C-alpha cells in the first residue's frame, strides 16, 4: 500500500523548452499527474516571489 501510494521517481523531473521561451513541464507518461499540484504550488510561489 505504501509503495503504491508514492509516485514514480524514474520517469520524472524533465523540463522541456519551446520556441516561445516558456518552460513547459513535459510529464511524459503517467506519474507526474499526482505531483502536478505540488509543482503548480511551487510555480505560483516562484511567480509571486518574482513579482515582489
Amino acid at each position: 500500500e505504501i509503495d503504491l501510494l508514492g509516485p514514480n521517481a524514474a520517469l520524472g523531473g524533465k523540463a522541456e523548452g519551446q520556441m516561445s521561451g516558456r518552460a513547459i513541464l513535459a510529464q511524459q507518461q503517467g506519474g507526474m499527474t499526482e505531483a502536478a499540484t505540488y509543482l503548480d504550488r511551487i510555480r505560483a510561489l516562484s511567480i509571486a516571489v518574482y513579482r515582489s
Binding site: 519551446q18 520556441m19 516561445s20 521561451g21 516558456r22
Partner: protein, 52 residues
C-alpha cells in the same frame, strides 16, 4: 496555452513555413520572434543592395 500573443503568432508562422506551401519572408519571422538581437537582425535584413 502560450505566454503571449506573439508566442502563438510565431508558433503558427513556423508551422505554416515548415510545410513550404506558403512562403513567409524572414523579416516577418524576426519581427514575430522573441529574440534579444531583433533590432540587429532587422537592420541587417532591411539593408538595401550594395552600392556596386
Amino acid at each position: 496555452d502560450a505566454p503571449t500573443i506573439a508566442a502563438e503568432e510565431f508558433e503558427q508562422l513556423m508551422k505554416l513555413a515548415s510545410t513550404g506551401i506558403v512562403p513567409i519572408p524572414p523579416d516577418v519571422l524576426i519581427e514575430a520572434s522573441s529574440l534579444r538581437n531583433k533590432p540587429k537582425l532587422l537592420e541587417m535584413l532591411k539593408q538595401g543592395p550594395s552600392q556596386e
